[PDB]
């Protein structure tokens, strides 16, 4: 659980910042596709609860 606590918050800290998402930086939104593509959201919700 501590290892997966490390694999998660690394990629959270590689998420491109919000002001670059307001601009149409296609490279920056390509990465934000990939990290969202990897992880299902509802997996977190059972973990968060």
């Amino acid at each position: 659980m501590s290892f997966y606590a490390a694999l998660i918050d690394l990629l959270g800290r590689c998420a491109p910042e919000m002001h670059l998402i307001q601009a149409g930086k296609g490279e920056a939104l390509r990465i934000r596709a990939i990290l969202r593509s990897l992880v299902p959201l509802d997996d977190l919700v059972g973990i968060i609860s």
Binding site: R30, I34, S37, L38
Partner: protein, 207 residues
């Protein structure tokens, strides 16, 4: 002896060892499947949906100012835009997933639009024999990476039989030139043609 622009190629893989050409139907069944060709002696495979013309080829930063906005030979580390010669549309990497196993393996299909998001691919040299800047010779091992998704066009063996998908496994690919610039008034393979002397018809069990 070297590849160029505007000349059709056919992607073929290798897996006993067996050569699978990559074709796709279009106008219905927008996804792509595989088709073998190593058993051409007992059964001729269908090459009608396997032709692919390279109508453009740019550098990596070169298309970057196409998106915000005659025969050039091509190199490793370039970008590429394939066209399905029968269906007059472009190959791309799609949004969905035909894996349904959380493999994060994207599915390869076709696209009608000429937008440059997922239509483009970059090639890469397989070993350290060649590198960036060198030309692609005829019959060299290639690795094709997405531009939008940054995944590799690879064969997948997990779900029963074999299929092609975009995920994080690299797979060798032969480009195999199939038709260069032909002269006018002459015949090559793939030509649809008539046989006059009065045509050569069939009946509309019609044999």
């Amino acid at each position: 002896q070297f590849l160029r622009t505007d000349d059709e190629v056919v992607l073929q893989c290798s897996a006993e060892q067996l050569k699978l050409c990559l074709a796709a139907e279009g106008f219905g069944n927008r996804l792509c499947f595989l088709e073998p060709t190593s058993n051409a002696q007992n059964v001729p495979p269908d090459l009608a949906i396997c032709c692919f013309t390279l109508e453009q080829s740019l550098s990596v930063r070169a298309l970057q100012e196409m998106l915000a906005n005659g025969h050039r030979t091509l190199l490793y580390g370039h970008a590429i835009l394939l066209r399905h010669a029968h269906s007059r549309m472009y190959l791309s990497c799609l949004t969905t997933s035909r894996s349904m196993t959380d493999k994060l393996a994207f599915d390869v299909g076709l696209q009608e639009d000429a937008t440059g998001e997922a239509c483009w691919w970059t090639m890469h040299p397989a070993s350290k024999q060649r590198s960036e800047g060198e030309k692609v010779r005829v019959g060299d091992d290639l690795i094709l990476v997405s531009v939008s998704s940054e995944r590799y066009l690879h064969l997948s063996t997990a779900s029963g039989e074999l299929q092609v998908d975009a995920s994080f496994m690299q797979t060798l690919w032969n480009m195999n030139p199939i038709c260069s610039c032909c002269e006018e008034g002459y015949v090559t393979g793939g030509h649809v043609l008539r046989l006059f002397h009065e045509c050569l018809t069939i009946s509309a069990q019609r044999r």
